[PDB]
Design a protein around this nucleic acid. Structure first.
Ligand code: FWN
Length: 132
DNA sequence: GCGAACGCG
DNA sequence: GCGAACGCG
């Protein structure tokens, strides 16, 4: 069950696809540790993907040993694969999110990390803390 | 809508 | 064995 000294992340979208953001919070406190400026077009899974990787980079900067919780099978897998498999068309209106996703892929393939990435078990625990 | 997890040849 | 037909915001 829950490791409380941990960071939780979640994505939110106005439309899917649409404007997406994300945040990370302290799983115990609910303290908002970071939040990303709105991105004009993205998907839920892209947003999540950026969120996990932001967290990874947040924690590593700080030499944290805390784990990250995510409720996304997909984003978790993409992170473990160091490869994002989004179906989102690449055009003028999606270049920003795709630049962001590629760079985070790049980061994952050019760096190591200690952080355990753990499934937030929603049926048992409720809404992950980082939900909007 | 996003992406992962039965029937054919 | 291969390809078509859940959890979360
Ligand atoms: C300026 C406060 O430091 C925040 C550290 O987080 C850095 C995250 O880097 C961007 C990851 O995509």
């Amino acid at each position: 069950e829950i490791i409380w000294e941990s960071l939780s992340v979640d994505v939110g979208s106005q439309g899917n696809p649409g404007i997406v953001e994300y945040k990370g919070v302290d799983t115990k406190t609910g303290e908002v540790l970071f939040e990303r400026e709105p991105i004009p077009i993205g998907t839920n899974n892209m947003g999540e993907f950026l969120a996990i990787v932001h967290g990874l980079r947040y924690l590593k900067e700080r030499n944290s040993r805390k784990p990250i919780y995510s409720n996304s099978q997909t984003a978790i897998k993409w992170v473990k694969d160091k490869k994002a498999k989004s179906t989102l068309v690449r055009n003028e209106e999606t270049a920003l999110i795709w630049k962001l996703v590629d760079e985070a892929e790049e980061w994952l393939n050019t760096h190591t990390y200690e952080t355990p990435i753990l499934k937030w078990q929603t049926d048992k625990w409720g809404e992950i803390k980082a939900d909007y």
